[PDB]
From Swiss-Prot, chain B:
Similarity-based family: Belongs to the flavin monoamine oxidase family.
Listed name of the protein: Amine oxidase [flavin-containing] B
UniProt source species: Homo sapiens (Human)
Positions where N6-acetyllysine occurs in the chain: K50
Gene3D superfamilies the record matches: 3.90.660.10, 6.10.250.130, FAD/NAD(P)-binding domain, Guanine Nucleotide Dissociation Inhibitor, domain 1
GO biological processes: dopamine catabolic process; hydrogen peroxide biosynthetic process; substantia nigra development
Lineage: Eukaryota, Metazoa, Chordata, Craniata, Vertebrata
Cofactor needs: FAD
Impact upon substituting H380R: Significant loss of activity
Subcellular compartments: Mitochondrion outer membrane
Length: 499, 494
């Protein structure tokens, strides 16, 4: 019944908030809708896989808060395999490449690719991390989808195709579904294009030994019976002295403050008395999550390594169910596996098939891409379609359609009386990731510590010391990368000499 | 506890479904979240206004279902005042005009405006009312916003400003927020641009004497205590023999079937056991409602009529709070009033202000547009911001952002086990309107009757005879309107 703070949601963000509050000597309860903690992180354990992450999994340099939290809980990371060649499969044909990015040989196509990525980062520098609506051209960029932007910037189909796949992979949505301002923000708040897409030196470098679900589970161990499983919150009342929070199984909790640690749109599942202020009321109907099936196909051996492929495949084309894969083999070298994402409209399209039919499509794809008949002999298959989760709404995260971020963005973490907002969607650095969940959870907890007079305002927003275990290499450009002209820049140079 | 059908939502759609099932001899219960019925229709009474519609209000020809249902409930209509001249206010100046549409004098601009409305209607003709995702170019049009379409079609800033205002007024959303495919379907399924925007012979022809809120109130009167007020539904369990529907105040209802008669996104307020199927689970997170404040300024007399203005103003620009107005005077000539909509982003921006501040801004606009100091002396003011409503989510209706209609559209009225779907959003003719609400409620009711073996499949979808009181005239075009070239077509011809 009675406590200091009710945390709604027992994913990373809610667990991280409850831990900070508990450590500060406050009585907290966590109310969790599911029969488990972890939310968008979920580690499945059985004999055939040992363990496998079916949700969030990858951590990388600059993600210092999740790395510190997991380290403090006794967790270790290992490196995702990138020793052998990556593959870029384009127009039915595979192009092995060393290094982080697929090489472009045609000089014109090269000027267009270079300019695309450079401009994305150039535009991002204009966007404040903590207030994207404040960018000088916010309105202009928000009233445009990513599709319109790619149509404007990319002077070759090659660049447009790769940029489209990049959008699909980063935000599990179609270029036409998403605001250009929002997507440019999302990339910039992760540290830029390189940092977001890279394995070595980027968001995909590492995973946790034993799975990422251990972060939430181990916080549950520390909190004991303070975590209430199968308590979907249905009702929040702020009319009286103390906040009343009701769950679906008719339990009532009473607190001084509430942290909402759930995807913004899932706030729709709760009835509010008094009603939410107008802007939030409408915002939560405007912020859908992406669509993705995460698929892991298990083999006897990591046969791709023998052919000198690491297992990273960037796969273009409508015919392909999976647009991106990584080696999901255990750090020990066993349970050989390929992890692939079925992204956006394909998640929708292929959900109609059975498990076995999807498995068949993935193997036949991998066989073609890796030039290997062995791909046709899987030993096991696991998958999770996140579109079907009542208490997630999708994965990886919330995207903003055109128009929304400039109109409703400033509401996302604005307190509603005694309700404070966490969840990765409210982060200012790696929002959408496990990293952002920790940031938002800990910041929301500290907003409440401030409200209670226990800390100064200057301590609500805290920087994180850099991990000594996963240090970040800076993102560098070369002279030619900075100053080579765009395609229309080259055309302007041509018409100037011939005049 | 026990009944044949639970209807969730006591708006026009739920009430229409409940009346039909009740009329068939079934035991129905209506579970309504608010302390009132009507939903997006709300009629307020006091001695200053007598009665005023703060939500949905207008009906017109081809809306034969709402007209029939209202007539059966003992309601009468009256005609919205359009006797005198309409006003187009452009670049700080008023241009009065007779006839339905604002005249255009520049020859390039004329061709541009003419081509725009024609192309809209031409595109609509390839879009099936009952399945817009089956349009030949469905994905192409769905992956474009209306702003992109407008940038592509409109060669003049004049045509683009007016087309933008048209989108704003029709769907209370910005051109960049909405799917081209969806908006084109929305117009088509109201009978086309002329039908949707016209007062005489269109959607704004008439109001109900006493208010439209009586539609819901009078069906509640029929149903008596079968309607449960302040019963927000929180939980629907379909794992057992009968369906179990729980409310927030802890009541349990048990039925053979359920009708969901609420805006699709509001289905999110309900926890489902078992979970909804995937496509619906995501669909209901992707479908917001628009933003609008409806504002009514009262005056001692309808002074605009003296200047040969009807009170309808079409007002261009960012500066103006209200882009569109109608005379809201009672048919008797008293309670003189101008109704105006604060649309889309302006509803967000101006909600920051106080009621008095909004009133002042409106009066100053009307004084400018009508060219009258009398506009500065209001006797009363009523307004309702629909954006703040927990159990509506906005007004007028649900809009589809780019990508969604082709991906999720077929999900809208697909039953989930024993849950059938009503609400104006699921209609195929005048969806978004009170008309669509009746169509959908009655169709979802008949789906259940068919699932009960009471009627054949053929009878789920039923045509409506034309209203004898409000007959429709056909929509005509001239030879020149059909064959005059577009701007690029005049250019290609030169
Ligand atoms: C808000 C508004 C709506 C309409 C207009 C104006 C405003 C301010 N105007 C019109 C126009 C529509 C144009 O697209 C219009 C605009 C400009 C020029 C001409 C016309 C109007 O003039 N005519 C018209 O026909 N319709 C208008 N507007 C829309 C209609 O009002 C609307 O379509 C219908 O009222 C919708 O009916 P519905 O039955 O499908 O749905 P709703 O009314 O929302 O009822 C749902 C009820 O459900 C309750 N509820 C929600 N969650 C619940 C839970 N969980 N449990 C139980 N009950 C729940 C809710 O409380 C509602 O009562
Ligand atoms: C689903 C998924 C998520 C992530 C990835 C993959 C999948 C399949 N992958 C990650 C990447 C994100 C990229 O943008 C990524 C992809 C590709 C390459 C590199 C990276 C990943 O690999 N790393 C990573 O850091 N994050 C990934 N993904 C996102 C994370 O999973 C996600 O960001 C965090 O898990 C979010 O944490 P939270 O903010 O705490 O939010 P939830 O997990 O959703 O927890 C909410 C809990 O609330 C409960 N709930 C909901 N409603 C309730 C009510 N009414 N009452 C009580 N409780 C309620 C719900 O059950 C949750 O437990």
């Amino acid at each position: 019944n009675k406590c200091d703070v009710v945390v709604v949601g027992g994913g990373i963000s809610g667990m991280a908030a409850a831990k900070l509050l508990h450590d500060s000597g406050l009585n907290v309860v966590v109310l969790e809708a599911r029969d488990r903690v972890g939310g968008r992180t979920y580690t499945l354990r059985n004999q055939k896989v040992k363990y496998v992450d079916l949700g969030g999994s990858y951590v990388g340099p600059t993600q210092n808060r999740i790395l510190r939290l997991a380290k403090e809980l006794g967790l270790e990371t290992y490196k995702v395999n990138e020793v052998e060649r990556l593959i870029h499969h384009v127009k039915g044909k595979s192009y092995p490449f060393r290094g982080p990015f697929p090489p472009v040989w045609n000089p014109i196509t090269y000027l267009d690719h270079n300019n695309f990525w450079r401009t994305m980062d150039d535009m991002g520098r204009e966007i404040p991390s903590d207030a994207p609506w404040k960018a000088p051209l916010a309105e202009e960029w928000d009233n445009m989808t990513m599709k319109e932007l790619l149509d404007k910037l990319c002077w070759t189909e090659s660049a447009k195709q790769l940029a489209t796949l990049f959008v699909n992979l980063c935000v599990t949505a179609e270029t036409h579904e998403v605001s250009a301002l929002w997507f440019l923000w999302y990339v910039k708040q992760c540290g830029g294009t390189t940092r977001i897409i890279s394995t070595t030196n980027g968001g995909q470098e590492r995973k946790f030994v034993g799975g990422s679900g251990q972060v939430s589970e181990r916080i549950m161990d520390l909190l004991g019976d303070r975590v209430k499983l199968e308590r979907p919150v249905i009702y929040i009342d702020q009319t009286r002295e103390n906040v009343l929070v009701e769950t679906l199984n008719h339990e009532m909790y009473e607190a001084k403050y509430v942290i909402s640690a759930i995807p913004p749109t899932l706030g729709m599942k709760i009835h509010f008395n008094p009603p939410l202020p107008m802007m939030r009321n409408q915002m939560i109907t405007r912020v859908p999550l992406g669509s993705v099936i995460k698929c892991i196909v298990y083999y006897k051996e990591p046969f791709w390594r023998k052919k000198d492929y690491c297992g990273t495949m960037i796969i273009d084309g409508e015919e392909a169910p999976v647009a991106y894969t990584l080696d999901d083999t255990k750090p020990e070298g066993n349970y050989a596996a390929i992890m692939g994402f079925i992204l956006a409209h394909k998640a929708r399209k292929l959900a109609r098939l059975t498990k076995e039919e999807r498995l068949k499509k993935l193997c036949e794809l991998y066989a073609k891409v890796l030039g290997s008949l062995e791909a046709l002999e899987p030993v096991h298959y696991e998958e999770k379609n996140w579109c079907e989760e009542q208490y997630s709404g999708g994965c990886y995260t919330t995207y903003f359609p055109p128009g929304i971020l400039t109109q409703y963005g400033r509401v996302l973490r604005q307190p509603v009386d005694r309700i404070y907002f966490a969840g990765t969607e409210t982060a200012t650095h790696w929002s959408g990731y496990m990293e952002g969940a920790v940031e938002a959870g800990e910041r929301a907890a500290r907003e409440i510590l401030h409200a209670m007079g226990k800390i100064p305002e200057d301590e609500i927003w805290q920087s994180e010391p850099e991990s000594v275990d996963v240090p970040a290499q800076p993102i560098t450009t070369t002279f030619l990368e900075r100053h080579l002209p765009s395609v229309p820049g080259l055309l302007r140079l041509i018409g100037l000499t011939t005049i």
